[PDB]
Motif scaffolding. Structure first.
Motif, PDB file in Angstrom:
ATOM      1  N   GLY A   1       0.776  -1.217   0.000  1.00  0.00           N
ATOM      2  CA  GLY A   1       0.000   0.000   0.000  1.00  0.00           C
ATOM      3  C   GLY A   1       0.811   1.272   0.000  1.00  0.00           C
ATOM      4  N   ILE A   2       2.094   1.197   0.346  1.00  0.00           N
ATOM      5  CA  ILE A   2       2.932   2.380   0.415  1.00  0.00           C
ATOM      6  C   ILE A   2       3.557   2.734  -0.933  1.00  0.00           C
ATOM      7  CG2 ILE A   2       5.058   3.311   1.421  1.00  0.00           C
ATOM      8  CD1 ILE A   2       3.951   1.221   3.835  1.00  0.00           C
ATOM      9  N   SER A   3       3.876   1.746  -1.776  1.00  0.00           N
ATOM     10  CA  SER A   3       4.629   1.994  -3.003  1.00  0.00           C
ATOM     11  C   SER A   3       3.795   1.934  -4.278  1.00  0.00           C
ATOM     12  CB  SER A   3       5.780   0.988  -3.127  1.00  0.00           C
ATOM     13  OG  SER A   3       5.339  -0.331  -2.854  1.00  0.00           O
ATOM     14  N   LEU A   4       2.586   1.373  -4.224  1.00  0.00           N
ATOM     15  CA  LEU A   4       1.768   1.189  -5.424  1.00  0.00           C
ATOM     16  C   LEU A   4       1.506   2.516  -6.136  1.00  0.00           C
ATOM     17  CD1 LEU A   4      -1.683   1.183  -6.132  1.00  0.00           C
ATOM     18  CD2 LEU A   4      -0.118  -0.346  -7.327  1.00  0.00           C
ATOM     19  N   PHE A   5       1.073   3.521  -5.380  1.00  0.00           N
ATOM     20  CA  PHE A   5       0.713   4.801  -5.969  1.00  0.00           C
ATOM     21  C   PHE A   5       1.919   5.539  -6.531  1.00  0.00           C
ATOM     22  CE2 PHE A   5      -3.117   4.614  -3.024  1.00  0.00           C
ATOM     23  CZ  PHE A   5      -3.922   4.146  -4.041  1.00  0.00           C
ATOM     24  N   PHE A   6       3.114   5.305  -5.988  1.00  0.00           N
ATOM     25  CA  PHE A   6       4.314   5.924  -6.543  1.00  0.00           C
ATOM     26  C   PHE A   6       4.677   5.328  -7.898  1.00  0.00           C
ATOM     27  CE2 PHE A   6       4.909   6.732  -1.946  1.00  0.00           C
ATOM     28  CZ  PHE A   6       4.810   8.103  -2.035  1.00  0.00           C
ATOM     29  N   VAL A   7       4.487   4.018  -8.065  1.00  0.00           N
ATOM     30  CA  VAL A   7       4.651   3.404  -9.381  1.00  0.00           C
ATOM     31  C   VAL A   7       3.651   3.992 -10.367  1.00  0.00           C
ATOM     32  CG1 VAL A   7       4.923   1.222 -10.588  1.00  0.00           C
ATOM     33  CG2 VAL A   7       5.353   1.340  -8.143  1.00  0.00           C
TER      34      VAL A   7
ATOM     35  N   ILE B   1       2.111  10.251   2.884  1.00  0.00           N
ATOM     36  CA  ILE B   1       2.055   9.620   1.567  1.00  0.00           C
ATOM     37  C   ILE B   1       1.155  10.412   0.629  1.00  0.00           C
ATOM     38  CG2 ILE B   1       1.249   7.584   0.323  1.00  0.00           C
ATOM     39  CD1 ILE B   1       2.177   6.023   2.944  1.00  0.00           C
ATOM     40  N   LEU B   2       0.009  10.880   1.127  1.00  0.00           N
ATOM     41  CA  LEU B   2      -0.920  11.610   0.273  1.00  0.00           C
ATOM     42  C   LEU B   2      -0.319  12.924  -0.209  1.00  0.00           C
ATOM     43  CD1 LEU B   2      -4.575  11.058   1.418  1.00  0.00           C
ATOM     44  CD2 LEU B   2      -3.164   9.933  -0.312  1.00  0.00           C
ATOM     45  N   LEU B   3       0.419  13.619   0.659  1.00  0.00           N
ATOM     46  CA  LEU B   3       1.091  14.838   0.225  1.00  0.00           C
ATOM     47  C   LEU B   3       2.198  14.538  -0.775  1.00  0.00           C
ATOM     48  CD1 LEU B   3       1.246  17.764   0.228  1.00  0.00           C
ATOM     49  CD2 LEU B   3       2.692  17.739   2.264  1.00  0.00           C
TER      50      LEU B   3
END
Ligand SMILES: C/C=C/C(=O)SCCNC(=O)CCNC(=O)[C@H](O)C(C)(C)COP(=O)(O)OP(=O)(O)OC[C@H]1O[C@@H](n2cnc3c(N)ncnc32)[C@H](O)[C@@H]1OP(=O)(O)O
Ligand SMILES: [Fe+3]
Lengths: 56, 75, 123, 125, 100, 29, 101, 494, 55, 488
Positions: H87-93, H334-336
């Protein structure tokens, strides 16, 4: 200028190939190794232009 | 899948085109040389894999000898 | 035609190592080195760029004091190069790097001394 | 050269010499455009980032200042070039090189004429 | 006290070679000759040690070193000759162009 | 009708022998 | 001169002869040995010819290359044959002519 | 142990896509501009779609690394490596895959003079960056991150605008290399204890307090140069300003996230005691940076220097939230991160639009652009608002959730951090009014053009992205909470 | 140099070598003291180690 | 009797081939009939063939090289370590020779004796690797050195080449005398010169109070000679001047082949031997000094050859760190570093030799190379980033082991020095990339395209550099094999 151009343009295939080989053979020099060998390499007359077309 | 022969042939092809490009020539200047390079790359890759297997086999025996010598100290 | 190459032509004189004086020609806005290489006073092959980072004082010239007043003062890099390239490692007060001198209309008639060429063709 | 400068003809990089142009002992600095049917005479100089219009005649020893558009017979100052115009010049040289690549790929290193010479000899005994 | 005296003879020859290096900044011919002195001092040590230990290995190496010394002197003097020919002088101010 | 350069003919034979020997060397190893 | 052929690493194949003579090793040459020899000699002659064209001595250069190749090819074949006879290389053929003869 | 995943869509194909694009382009003649452009754009778009599918198959109930797959390095199998996301790295990819096609689209008009070298560099950057975000190993993280320096160096030095790009690229490469070397020292320190550098394993190995402190300081030095944190933040202004527009977009939108991601992936969970002892130290540096660098932003006179200086203040708010060690703090951090990767990139895109036409970055030359570029002015104002953390925008969600997390730990740091609201609004509005409002200055600029069709399309996904996360951030928080919860709980058992 | 300068130098060097002989004799005469000092210092180190190894 | 010489078939063949080439060259270079043809390229091709045939003979007869080991024992010792070291040396010689043909043709260096001296020095280095006694070691070292002195002054009319030859001769003779003194001291103290006898006498005592001062100083002087040979600080100053002043093929050959031969000698004389950590401290301090001085001096350089010379000095420091730690992994990493540095150096010198047809002299001469030859600029940049140690390139292994050994052997000053020197090196390596890619000079230099030999070698080395870490197992296993062959 016409003389040198007329001479070059009328050369046959055999002479063209002979002068291509000569031009390749005399393009560079190693006068130091020549002096070690005790020889002096001279530019052949077919590769020397007449004095009347040179800048000097 | 991905085998030594395929990777080697691709690397041989790449080398010939890389060599042509370094000389500022067209990529496919002498295509028979590309064929030769693919063959050589395939041969080299298969030989390299076989050599790696043999090297590991020899290293195992030599480490066996080293460990035996080191275990001799506690006798 | 209004603008002519002769507008930029700067007259010069150069004294060669053997002492004979030659009248040479260069364009203002270009370096003294280029004017010196036009007639082969300095071999163009020995100094192909006008950059201080491609200089081993092959372009070195000697200029009398009456013309040194009319040039910008030597920077630290120039003096570093001149001093290291000296045989005796002594800075010459009249020495300039020809690649750093830019010809101007104010340099008309300047006399420059061309020293003997240093070896430059590293094997 | 009448100017006294070395009289070699030097066409520097990214120079577009338009068709039917006559050059003799002129220097063209990098990133210039010479218009079609132009004439550059002995000792003349075209400084960098300049454009000559088609049909221009540059007399001997004359000069085209950098960053300008010139034209006419003889060449006369027209106007000063914008910086975008000067950025366009190496792009034109690159495009012409790209076109020349298509012609370069039409020729193999050897021709087949020697075979025609062979058979023309053979028919002749 | 024989061995120590032979060894100090070789020692003074080696030390003189070192000193010749130190004292001849402007004389590279004597720098070469000082190096030859150092090589003679080592050759003598091998002979003296071979006698002292009653072992022939010192003498074999002594002969082979003499061969090396001869070859090295020949080539060194050749390089000296060509340097002199190119410059016309042997002064050290003309062999310092490579630097930095 | 005939190639006359005898050194070139010998070199051609040598290249042929090299190629055929390489093939046989692979096939019998 | 006292001689001793004893090798550091022992042979891994049956020892047909521990110190085979020169003539015996040569007579032991197989078709593979003659193939290696001929390939090395032919490659060397080819390199001599091709490298000799520019100086104009392709003939003598062929001779010199062929001499180097003959020497190296014989050396390689002798190496292989002697190593087979001493058991350092796989030598099933040599063992056949030993059990039988 | 082979860990190959059963899913059709996996990390390997997403990694390979831009590699295949780059390998294809090396052989295509530079004369074929239309083909090169379309190949690069299509490859990047396919990668973005693949990342969206990766989002679709995501499990938001598990704390276990998902889509885990292994790649062997040696036939001894002693050193084996793993790929996986959470859940921490998915959105960065997903953000990386979204930003790369934007970068290809930005230089569409100048691709005649850029060439395949421009598209290749950005594709290689994409491949390396996704790899970095997908690693479960300390060693491969180091290699792939250290590798991103070469294409970024090339991108800055070749397509930068002025000669200051030399100094800028030098400083970028050297600062980042120093930090990476410090990380390498920490990775070898860990290896000497553990015998391995596998994340799943080191999460289960206890480190002594003294070694936790020392390993934390080496990890800190690496991550704090990339955050950036004071006083090693000075490379960022020159680097981000001197870079080309797409280079700036990648530098601020993705590359800045590697340090804060390294805090979340490695430093915080692995050394929980060291994290607590250093929280006041982190709070001080972060709070100083927000106040100092915001006041510096006020007095900058360069359009790009203002936007770039703004990122330092925003990233140090991110560090405050992630070191609060609660759900609001880490979830807000993470959202920021993602919101900043959208707002900062769009703001760099707005300035790039202006610099492409007028070739100046000085604020004093502009003014009165509302009367000649109303469409640009409207879009510029929206992203100006999103940079002030206005409610309704995505950046407010991250900003407030961090302030909530910081308040429950230390009220003082929350108050100093909340001063970013006053200062952030001051320079953002000052920038907008000096550029867009007022009267035209025809002595400086008299020829204008509003946004074209390509520029309008570029901004649309950015506008949709900020509004979407701004009003309904539940789609993101739903997929992060389990991984976030297990990150906070790591190291304690009550 | 003059012949007499060379001979005076040789005489000086002869005196130097005789002094070297005296030095060698002196160094030989102090072998027992040096070995005794070495033994005492080795005993000191060994006692210190054995007392430190105790803890 | 004949079969005893199977242990020396490669050396016999290469020596005989060198004699054949000498006779061929002298007979036809003096010939009036053929107009005194230059034979440097003809003899060069035949000598490349001879080197390859020697490599085949050595590689194929791996067990036979150990035959009659008792009979040959007092002359040399052949084992696995020497086997792989010699194969590497022959490959390096072959690549160096292949890079010389454009230099022979376009420069017109017509001396075929250059090839013959390279072949004789290769014979010398072959004998160095298998040396197992101080006498044999010294003789082989001296044959090697004499060949190098002659070839370094091969441009006999050039000021630079003659100066390099003179400095080389004087300093090399000095260091050789120092090393010979060390050997004499060891022989006098132990009555032995064979490496086995030395191993037995020295083992078990090191510095036990009653320390043989003769053995100590013999070790010291021999170490000084070895450190001169590997260009280690403070016995290094000859190397930059000689590297710059020699002809570029000579510089290429000196930067690779002699390091392999002398590191083999160092590993067999000391690791196989026995003394206190004193020698390890010697190499440790020399490694630190070499990294610092190499980094700073390379940062100061404006010329390509001098920069490469100082870079090599820094990297030998990095390599000697592996010798100092005294573990099996130390020797393995030293061998890996030597291999990778050799390949990278051959890549760089192929590029330099390609650019020397246009007389590249300064770093600034590489301006706009990314425009005038884009593929070449990328190849040189891959090499420069490999030099800087940036992953995933092959040059990263040396950096990795440097830091690994330090944090294991317990060193932190060494880690600090490594960090600072690595950053400095990265700066002065990426300066070359900046020059080829970022600068926009007023005047460009257009370089003649390279010949086929250098392009093929460049393509292969560039593929290795970019891709070695994807499949590195054979190198790791073979280096581990060699490290153990030294002891057991
Ligand atoms: C060894 C081999 C020898 C050969 O065979 S020659 C090979 C081919 N070379 C040639 O044909 C060179 C011929 N030379 C010329 O034509 C030349 O011009 C020319 C020789 C008339 C005239 O050249 P000039 O430099 O001497 O021109 P003027 O001094 O008369 O200038 C007068 C005026 O005319 C104008 N100008 C001059 N020339 C021309 C023209 N033509 N047209 C228009 N306008 C001009 C111009 O405004 C001029 O004013 P300025 O620029 O302020 O000086
Ligand atoms: Fe200069």
């Amino acid at each position: 200028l016409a003389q040198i151009h007329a001479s070059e343009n009328s050369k046959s295939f055999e002479q063209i190939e002979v002068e291509r080989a000569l031009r390749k053979k005399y393009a560079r020099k190693d006068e130091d190794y020549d002096s070690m060998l005790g020889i002096t390499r001279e530019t052949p007359p077919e590769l020397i232009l007449p004095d009347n077309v040179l800048p000097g | 899948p991905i085998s030594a022969t395929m990777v080697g042939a691709l690397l041989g092809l790449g080398t010939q085109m890389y060599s042509n490009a370094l000389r500022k020539l067209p990529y496919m200047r002498h295509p028979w040389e590309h064929v030769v390079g693919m063959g050589l790359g395939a041969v080299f890759a298969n030989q390299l894999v076989k050599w790696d297997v043999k090297l590991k086999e020899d290293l195992d025996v030599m480490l066996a000898k080293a460990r035996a010598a080191n275990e001799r100290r506690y006798f | 035609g209004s603008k002519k190459v002769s507008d930029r032509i700067v007259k010069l004189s150069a004294i060669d190592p053997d002492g004979y004086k030659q009248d040479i020609i260069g364009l203002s806005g270009q370096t003294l080195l280029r004017a010196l290489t036009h007639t082969g006073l300095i071999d163009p092959a020995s100094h192909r760029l006008d950059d201080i980072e491609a200089c081993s004082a092959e372009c070195e010239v000697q200029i009398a004091e009456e013309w040194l007043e009319k040039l910008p003062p030597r920077t630290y890099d120039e003096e570093y190069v001149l001093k290291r390239s000296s045989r005796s490692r002594i800075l010459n007060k009249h020495s300039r790097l020809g690649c750093q001198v830019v010809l101007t209309q104010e340099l008309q008639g300047m006399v420059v001394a061309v020293p003997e060429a240093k070896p430059w063709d590293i094997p | 050269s009448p100017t006294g400068l070395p009289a070699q003809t030097l066409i520097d990089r990214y120079v577009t010499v338009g068709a039917y142009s006559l050059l003799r002992s002129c220097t063209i600095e990098p990133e210039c455009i010479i218009g079609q049917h132009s004439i550059l005479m002995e000792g003349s100089l075209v400084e960098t980032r300049s454009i000559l219009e088609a049909g221009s005649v540059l007399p001997p020893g004359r000069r085209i200042p950098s960053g300008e558009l010139w034209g006419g017979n003889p060449a006369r100052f027209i106007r000063t070039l914008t910086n975008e115009e000067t950025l366009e010049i190496p792009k034109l040289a690159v495009a012409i090189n790209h076109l020349s690549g298509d012609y370069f790929s039409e020729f193999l290193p050897y021709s087949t004429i020697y075979l025609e010479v062979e058979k023309f000899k053979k028919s002749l005994g | 006290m024989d061995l120590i005296k032979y060894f100090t003879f070789s020692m003074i020859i080696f030390i003189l070679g070192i000193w010749g290096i130190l004292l001849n900044r402007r004389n590279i011919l004597i720098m070469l000759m000082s190096i030859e002195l150092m090589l003679l001092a080592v050759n003598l040590n091998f002979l003296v040690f071979s006698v002292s230990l009653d072992d022939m290995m010192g003498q074999v190496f002594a002969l082979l070193v003499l061969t090396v010394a001869a070859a090295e002197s020949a080539i060194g003097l050749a390089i000296f000759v060509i340097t002199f020919r190119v410059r016309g002088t042997i002064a050290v101010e003309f062999i310092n162009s490579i630097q930095g | 009708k005939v190639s006359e350069d005898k050194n070139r003919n010998y070199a051609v034979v040598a290249g042929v022998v090299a190629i055929v020997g390489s093939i046989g060397w692979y096939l019998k190893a | 001169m006292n001689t001793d052929i004893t090798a550091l690493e022992k042979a891994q194949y049956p020892v047909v002869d521990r110190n085979p003579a020169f003539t015996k090793v040569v007579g032991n040459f197989s078709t593979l040995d003659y193939l290696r020899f001929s390939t090395i000699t032919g490659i060397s002659v080819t390199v001599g010819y091709l490298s000799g064209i520019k100086p104009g001595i392709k003939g003598p250069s062929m001779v010199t290359g062929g001499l180097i190749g003959l020497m190296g090819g014989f050396m390689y074949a002798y190496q292989n044959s002697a190593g087979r006879l001493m058991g350092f290389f796989p030598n099933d053929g040599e063992v056949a002519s030993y059990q039988k003869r | 142990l082979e860990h190959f995943c059963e899913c059709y869509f996996n990390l390997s194909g997403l990694i390979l896509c831009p590699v295949l694009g780059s390998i294809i382009l090396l052989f295509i003649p530079n004369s074929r501009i239309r083909l090169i452009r379309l190949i690069g754009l299509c490859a990047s778009l396919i990668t973005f779609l693949y990342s969206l599918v990766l989002w679709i198959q995501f499990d938001s109930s598990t704390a276990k690394f998902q889509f885990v797959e292994s790649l062997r390095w040696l036939p001894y199998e002693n050193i084996n490596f793993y790929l996986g996301i959470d859940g921490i790295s998915l959105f960065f990819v997903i953000l990386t895959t979204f930003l790369i096609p934007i970068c290809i689209l930005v230089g569409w008009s100048g691709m005649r003079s850029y060439g395949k070298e421009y598209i290749i560099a950005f594709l290689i950057c994409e491949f390396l960056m996704i790899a970095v975000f997908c690693m479960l190993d300390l060693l491969l993280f180091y290699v792939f991150f250290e590798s991103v320096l070469i294409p970024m160096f090339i991108i800055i030095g070749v397509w930068g605008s002025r000669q200051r790009k030399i100094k800028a690229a030098y400083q970028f490469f050297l600062y980042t290399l120093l930090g990476s070397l410090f990380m390498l020292l920490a990775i070898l320190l860990i290896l000497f204890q553990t015998g391995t550098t596998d994340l799943q394993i080191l999460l289960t190995t206890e480190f002594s307090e003294r070694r936790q402190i020392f390993l934390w300081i080496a990890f800190f030095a690496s991550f704090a140069v990339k955050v950036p944190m004071v006083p090693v933040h000075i490379w960022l202004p020159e680097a981000h300003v001197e870079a080309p527009t797409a280079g700036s977009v990648i530098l601020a939108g993705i590359l800045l996230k590697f340090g804060t991601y390294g805090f979340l992936r490695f430093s915080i969970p692995m050394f929980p005691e060291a994290t607590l002892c250093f929280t006041p130290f982190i709070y001080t540096l972060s709070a100083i940076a927000i106040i100092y660098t915001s006041l510096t932003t006020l007095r900058q006179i360069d359009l790009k220097k203002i936007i770039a200086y703004s990122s330092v203040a925003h990233m140090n708010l991110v560090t405050i939230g992630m070191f609060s060690l609660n759900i609001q703090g880490i979830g807000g951090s993470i959202l920021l991160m993602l919101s900043h990767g959208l707002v900062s990139s769009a703001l760099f895109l707005c300035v790039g639009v202006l610099y492409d036409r007028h070739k100046t970055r000085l604020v004093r030359y502009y003014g009165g652009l509302v009367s000649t570029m109303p469409n640009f002015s409207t879009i510029f104002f929206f992203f100006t608002l999103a940079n002030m953390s206005l409610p309704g925008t995505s950046s407010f969600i991250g900003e407030f959730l961090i302030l909530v997390g910081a308040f429950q730990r230390n009220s003082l740091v929350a108050t100093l951090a909340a001063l970013g609201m006053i200062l952030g609004a001051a320079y953002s509005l000052w920038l907008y009014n000096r550029v867009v409002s007022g009267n035209l200055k025809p002595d400086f600029l008299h020829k204008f053009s509003d946004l074209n069709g390509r520029e309008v399309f570029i901004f649309i996904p950015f506008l949709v992205g900020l509004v979407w996360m701004g009003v309904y951030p539940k789609v993101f928080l739903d997929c992060m909470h389990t991984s976030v919860s297990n990150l906070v709980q790591h190291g304690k058992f009550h | 140099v003059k012949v007499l300068t060379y001979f005076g130098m040789t005489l000086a060097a002869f005196a130097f070598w005789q002094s070297m002989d005296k030095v060698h004799v002196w160094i030989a005469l102090h072998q027992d003291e040096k070995q005794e000092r070495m033994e005492k210092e080795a005993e000191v180190r060994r006692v210190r180690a054995e007392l430190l190894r105790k803890a | 009797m004949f079969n005893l010489f199977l242990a020396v078939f490669p050396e016999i063949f290469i020596i005989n081939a060198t004699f054949i080439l000498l006779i061929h060259g002298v007979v036809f270079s003096t010939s009036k009939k053929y107009d005194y043809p230059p034979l440097a390229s003809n003899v060069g091709w035949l000598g490349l063939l001879s080197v390859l045939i020697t490599l085949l003979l050595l590689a194929a007869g791996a067990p036979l090289l150990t035959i009659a080991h008792l009979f040959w024992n007092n002359l040399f010792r052949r084992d696995n370590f020497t086997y792989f070291c010699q194969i590497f040396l022959l490959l390096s010689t072959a690549g160096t020779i292949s890079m010389c043909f454009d230099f022979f043709d376009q420069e017109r260096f017509d001396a075929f004796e250059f090839i013959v001296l390279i072949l004789l020095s290769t014979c010398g280095m072959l004998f160095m690797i298998s040396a197992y006694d101080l006498i044999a070691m010294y003789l082989a070292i001296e044959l090697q050195s004499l060949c190098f002195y002659v070839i370094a002054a091969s441009k006999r009319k050039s000021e630079f080449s003659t100066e390099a030859g003179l400095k080389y001769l004087i300093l090399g003779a000095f260091s050789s005398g120092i090393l010979l003194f060390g050997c004499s001291m060891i022989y006098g103290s132990t009555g032995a010169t064979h490496f086995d006898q030395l191993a037995k006498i020295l083992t078990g005592y090191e510095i036990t109070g009653a320390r043989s001062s003769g053995i100590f100083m013999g070790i010291l002087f021999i170490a000084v000679g070895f450190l001169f040979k590997i260009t280690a600080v403070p016995f290094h100053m000859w190397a930059p001047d000689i590297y710059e002043g020699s002809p570029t093929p000579v510089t290429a050959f000196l930067s690779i082949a002699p390091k392999i031969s002398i590191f083999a000698n160092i590993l067999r004389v000391f690791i196989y031997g026995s003394y206190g950590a004193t020698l390890q401290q010697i190499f440790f301090f020399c490694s630190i000094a070499s990294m610092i001085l190499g980094a700073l001096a390379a940062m100061a350089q404006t010329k390509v050859k001098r920069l490469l010379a100082y870079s090599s000095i820094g990297h030998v420091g990095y390599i000697c760190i592996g010798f100092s730690c005294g573990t099996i992994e130390g020797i393995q990493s030293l061998l890996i570093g030597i291999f990778i540095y050799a390949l990278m150096t051959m890549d760089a010198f192929a590029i330099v030799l390609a650019l020397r047809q246009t007389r590249v002299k300064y770093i600034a001469d590489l301006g706009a190379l990314a425009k005038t030859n884009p593929i070449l600029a990328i190849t040189f940049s891959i090499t420069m980033f490999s030099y800087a140690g940036i992953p995933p390139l092959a040059g990263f292994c040396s950096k990795f082991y440097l830091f690994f050994a330090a944090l294991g052997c317990g060193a932190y000053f060494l880690a600090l020095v490594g960090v600072v020197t690595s950053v400095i090196g990265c700066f002065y390596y990426i300066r070359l990339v900046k020059r080829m890619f970022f600068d926009t000079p007023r005047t460009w230099i257009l370089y003649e395209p390279m010949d086929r030999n250098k392009s093929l070698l460049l393509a292969m080395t560039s593929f290795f550099i970019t891709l070695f870490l994807l499949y590195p197992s054979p190198l790791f296993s073979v280096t581990h094999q060699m490290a153990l062959s030294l002891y057991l």
